[PDB]
Design a protein around this ligand. Structure first.
Ligand SMILES: [Zn+2]
Ligand SMILES: [Zn+2]
Length: 131
């Protein structure tokens, strides 16, 4: 069921590279978000399923995707979201994490095409920004 699905890293990145090509072809923007959790070992399990659900909430169309990027980082891309509306989505994610309380995290986003057009560069930059 798509409404519950979270993709493994390489699966996620394959879907992202497809979307990157489609965005180029159709002149449509999209935005990538990274969220890294920075909590103690024995609260990692809890925060993982919670931030996962929060990012799933941002999914507006079936192509939008959430991925387990690393053992403590999630990634998300949302099609049709450019520089104008990307900050609103980031604030919503932060508000949901705030509503939970007690989760330490870093968040960053890159919008195509205004922030980047080279996908591997965006990905490297997002890693550094939440590290
Ligand atoms: Zn909500
Ligand atoms: Zn490059």
């Amino acid at each position: 069921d798509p409404l519950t699905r979270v993709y493994a890293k390489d699966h996620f990145l394959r879907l992202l590279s497809y979307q990157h090509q489609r965005a180029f072809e159709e002149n449509t923007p999209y935005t990538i978000f990274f969220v890294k959790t920075k909590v103690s070992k024995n609260e990692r399990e809890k925060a993982l399923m919670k931030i996962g659900k929060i990012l799933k909430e941002c999914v507006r169309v079936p192509l939008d995707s959430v991925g387990r990027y690393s053992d403590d980082t999630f990634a998300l891309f949302v099609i049709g979201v450019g520089k104008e509306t990307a900050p609103n989505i980031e604030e919503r994610i932060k508000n949901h994490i705030e509503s939970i309380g007690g989760i330490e995290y870093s968040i960053a986003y890159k919008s195509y095409p205004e922030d980047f057009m080279d996908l591997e560069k965006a990905i490297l930059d997002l890693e550094k920004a939440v590290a």
